[PDB]
PDB file of C-alpha atoms in Angstrom:
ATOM      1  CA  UNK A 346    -100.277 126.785 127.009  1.00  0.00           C
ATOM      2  CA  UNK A 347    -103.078 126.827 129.528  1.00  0.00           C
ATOM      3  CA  UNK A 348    -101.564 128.600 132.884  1.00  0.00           C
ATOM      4  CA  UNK A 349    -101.630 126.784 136.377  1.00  0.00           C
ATOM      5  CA  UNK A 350    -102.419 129.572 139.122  1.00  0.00           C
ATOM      6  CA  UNK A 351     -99.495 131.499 140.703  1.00  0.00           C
ATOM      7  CA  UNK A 352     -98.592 130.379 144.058  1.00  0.00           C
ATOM      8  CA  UNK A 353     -99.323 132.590 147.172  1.00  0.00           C
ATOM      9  CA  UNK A 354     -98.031 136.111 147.057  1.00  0.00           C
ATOM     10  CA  UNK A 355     -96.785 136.326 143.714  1.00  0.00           C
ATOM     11  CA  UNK A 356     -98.037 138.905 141.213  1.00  0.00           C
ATOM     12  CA  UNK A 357     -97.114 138.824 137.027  1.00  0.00           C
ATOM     13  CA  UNK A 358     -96.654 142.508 136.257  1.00  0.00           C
ATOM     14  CA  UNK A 359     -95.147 144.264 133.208  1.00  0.00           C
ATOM     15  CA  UNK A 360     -91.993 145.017 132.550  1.00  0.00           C
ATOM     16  CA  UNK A 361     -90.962 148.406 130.288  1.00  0.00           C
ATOM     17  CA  UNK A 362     -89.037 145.425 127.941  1.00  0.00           C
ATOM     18  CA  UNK A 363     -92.846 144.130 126.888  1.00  0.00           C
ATOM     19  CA  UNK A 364     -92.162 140.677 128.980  1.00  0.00           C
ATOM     20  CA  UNK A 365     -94.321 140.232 131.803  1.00  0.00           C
ATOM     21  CA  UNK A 366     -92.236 139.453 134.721  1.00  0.00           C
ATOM     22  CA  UNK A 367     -93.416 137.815 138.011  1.00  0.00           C
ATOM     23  CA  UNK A 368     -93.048 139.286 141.464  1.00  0.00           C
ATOM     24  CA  UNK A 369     -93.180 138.237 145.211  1.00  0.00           C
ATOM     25  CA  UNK A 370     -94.278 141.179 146.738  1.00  0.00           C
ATOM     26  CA  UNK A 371     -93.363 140.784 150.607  1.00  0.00           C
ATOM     27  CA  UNK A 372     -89.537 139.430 150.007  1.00  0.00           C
ATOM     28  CA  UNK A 373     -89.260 141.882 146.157  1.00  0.00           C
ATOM     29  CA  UNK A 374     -87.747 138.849 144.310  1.00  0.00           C
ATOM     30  CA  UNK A 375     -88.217 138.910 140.599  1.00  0.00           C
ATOM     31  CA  UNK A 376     -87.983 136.354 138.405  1.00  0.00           C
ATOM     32  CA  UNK A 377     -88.727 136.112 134.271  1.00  0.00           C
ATOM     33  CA  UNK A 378     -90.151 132.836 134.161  1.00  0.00           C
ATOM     34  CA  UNK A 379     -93.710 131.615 135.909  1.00  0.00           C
ATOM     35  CA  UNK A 380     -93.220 130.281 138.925  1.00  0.00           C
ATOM     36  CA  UNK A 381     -94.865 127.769 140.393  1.00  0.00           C
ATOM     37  CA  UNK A 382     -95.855 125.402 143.702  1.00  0.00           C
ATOM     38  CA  UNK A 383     -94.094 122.089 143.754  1.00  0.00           C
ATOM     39  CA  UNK A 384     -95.917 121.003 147.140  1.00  0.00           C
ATOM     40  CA  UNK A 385     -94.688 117.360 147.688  1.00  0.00           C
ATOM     41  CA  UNK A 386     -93.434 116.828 144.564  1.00  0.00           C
ATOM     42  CA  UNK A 387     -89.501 115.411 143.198  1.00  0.00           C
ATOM     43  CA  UNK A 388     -87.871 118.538 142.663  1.00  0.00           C
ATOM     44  CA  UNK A 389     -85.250 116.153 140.097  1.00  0.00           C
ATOM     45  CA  UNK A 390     -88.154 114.452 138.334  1.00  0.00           C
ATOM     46  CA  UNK A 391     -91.236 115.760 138.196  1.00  0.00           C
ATOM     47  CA  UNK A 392     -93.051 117.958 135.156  1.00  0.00           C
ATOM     48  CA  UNK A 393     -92.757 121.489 135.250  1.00  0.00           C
ATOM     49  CA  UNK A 394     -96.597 123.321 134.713  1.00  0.00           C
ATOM     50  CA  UNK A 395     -95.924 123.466 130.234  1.00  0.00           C
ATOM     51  CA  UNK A 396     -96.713 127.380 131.258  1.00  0.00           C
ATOM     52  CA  UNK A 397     -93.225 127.355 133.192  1.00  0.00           C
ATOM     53  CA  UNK A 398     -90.990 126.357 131.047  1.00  0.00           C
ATOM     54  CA  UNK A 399     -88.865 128.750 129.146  1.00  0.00           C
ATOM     55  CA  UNK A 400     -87.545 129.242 126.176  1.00  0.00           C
TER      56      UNK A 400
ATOM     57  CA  UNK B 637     -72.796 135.970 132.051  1.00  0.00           C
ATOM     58  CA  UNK B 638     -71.560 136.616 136.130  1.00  0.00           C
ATOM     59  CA  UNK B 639     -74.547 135.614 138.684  1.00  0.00           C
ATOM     60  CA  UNK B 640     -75.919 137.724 140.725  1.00  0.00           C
ATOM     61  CA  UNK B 641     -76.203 135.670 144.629  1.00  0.00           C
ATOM     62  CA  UNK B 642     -79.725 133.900 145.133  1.00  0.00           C
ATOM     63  CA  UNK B 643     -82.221 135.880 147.506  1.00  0.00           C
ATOM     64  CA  UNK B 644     -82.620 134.571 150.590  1.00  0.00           C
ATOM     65  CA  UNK B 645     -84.442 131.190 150.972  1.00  0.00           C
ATOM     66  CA  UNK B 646     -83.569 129.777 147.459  1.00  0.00           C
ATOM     67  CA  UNK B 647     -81.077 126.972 146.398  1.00  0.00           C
ATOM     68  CA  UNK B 648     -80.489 125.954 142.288  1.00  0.00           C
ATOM     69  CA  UNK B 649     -80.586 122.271 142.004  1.00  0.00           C
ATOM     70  CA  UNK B 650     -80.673 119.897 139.233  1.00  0.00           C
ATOM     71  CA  UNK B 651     -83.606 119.011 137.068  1.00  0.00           C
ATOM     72  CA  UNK B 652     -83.209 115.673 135.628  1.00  0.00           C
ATOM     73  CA  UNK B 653     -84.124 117.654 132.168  1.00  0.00           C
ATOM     74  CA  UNK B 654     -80.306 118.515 132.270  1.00  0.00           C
ATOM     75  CA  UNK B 655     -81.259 122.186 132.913  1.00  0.00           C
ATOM     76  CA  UNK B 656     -80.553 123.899 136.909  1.00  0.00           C
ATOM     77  CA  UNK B 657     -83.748 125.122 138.526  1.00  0.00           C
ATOM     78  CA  UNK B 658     -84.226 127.512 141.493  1.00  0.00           C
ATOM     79  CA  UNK B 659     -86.404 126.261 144.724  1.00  0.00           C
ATOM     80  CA  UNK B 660     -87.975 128.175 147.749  1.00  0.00           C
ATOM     81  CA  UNK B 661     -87.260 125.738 150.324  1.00  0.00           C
ATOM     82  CA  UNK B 662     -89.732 126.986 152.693  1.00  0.00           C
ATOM     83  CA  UNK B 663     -92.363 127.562 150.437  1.00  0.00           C
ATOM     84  CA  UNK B 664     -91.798 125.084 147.510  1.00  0.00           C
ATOM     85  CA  UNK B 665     -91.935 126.959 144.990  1.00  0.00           C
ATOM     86  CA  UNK B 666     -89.648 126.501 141.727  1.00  0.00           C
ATOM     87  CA  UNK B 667     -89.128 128.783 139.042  1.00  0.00           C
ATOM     88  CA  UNK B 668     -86.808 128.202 135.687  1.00  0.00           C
ATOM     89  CA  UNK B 669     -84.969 131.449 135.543  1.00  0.00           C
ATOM     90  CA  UNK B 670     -82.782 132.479 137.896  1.00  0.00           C
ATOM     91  CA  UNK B 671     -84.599 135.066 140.776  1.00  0.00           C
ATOM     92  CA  UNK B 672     -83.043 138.244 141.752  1.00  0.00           C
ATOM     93  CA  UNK B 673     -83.826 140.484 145.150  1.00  0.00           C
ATOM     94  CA  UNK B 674     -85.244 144.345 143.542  1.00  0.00           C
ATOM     95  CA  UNK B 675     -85.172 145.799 146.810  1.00  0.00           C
ATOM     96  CA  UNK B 676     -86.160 149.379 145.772  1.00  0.00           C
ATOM     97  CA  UNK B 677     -85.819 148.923 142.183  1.00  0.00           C
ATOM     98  CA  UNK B 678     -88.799 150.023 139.564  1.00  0.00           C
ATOM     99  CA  UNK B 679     -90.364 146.572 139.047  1.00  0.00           C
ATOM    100  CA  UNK B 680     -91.268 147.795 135.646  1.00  0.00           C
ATOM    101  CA  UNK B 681     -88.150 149.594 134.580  1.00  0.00           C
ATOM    102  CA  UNK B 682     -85.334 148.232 136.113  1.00  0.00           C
ATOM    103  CA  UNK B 683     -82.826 146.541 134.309  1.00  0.00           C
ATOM    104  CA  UNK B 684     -82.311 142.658 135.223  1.00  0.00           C
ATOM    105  CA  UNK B 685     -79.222 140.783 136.691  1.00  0.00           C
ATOM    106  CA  UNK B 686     -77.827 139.698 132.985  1.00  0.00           C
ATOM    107  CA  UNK B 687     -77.454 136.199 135.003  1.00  0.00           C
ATOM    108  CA  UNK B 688     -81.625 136.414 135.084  1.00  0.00           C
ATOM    109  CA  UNK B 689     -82.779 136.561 131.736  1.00  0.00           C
ATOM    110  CA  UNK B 690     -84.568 133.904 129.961  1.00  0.00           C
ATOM    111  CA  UNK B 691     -83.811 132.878 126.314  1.00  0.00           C
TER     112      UNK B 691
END
């Protein structure tokens, strides 16, 4: 899918596995699926950017 | 698998898609797969929480 920007700080970087992997560099929390800024939206109901969902 | 506990700042919640997801309550961000802390871990070499990989 088309990819909604990464929110601030975060960097996707590769990972020796061949999956990129996305990384906040001031706090060095990893995680394997795009993250992304909610703002003011329902955490419960709202859509998910398609380029966040997993699997 | 066993988790690994949340870095700092994050909560998993419930998605009304049936499936947990994991908020930055100070920043809003949400990702789908559970984040992990690297500290001084080799971004592209370590090996991830088994709790944090994605399908």
């Amino acid at each position: 899918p088309p990819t909604e920007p990464l929110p601030d700080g975060w960097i996707m970087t590769f990972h020796n596995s061949g999956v990129p992997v996305y990384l906040h560099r001031e706090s060095r929390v990893v995680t394997w699926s795009r993250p992304y800024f909610l703002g003011t939206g329902s955490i419960r109901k709202h859509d998910p950017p398609l380029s966040s969902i997993p699997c």
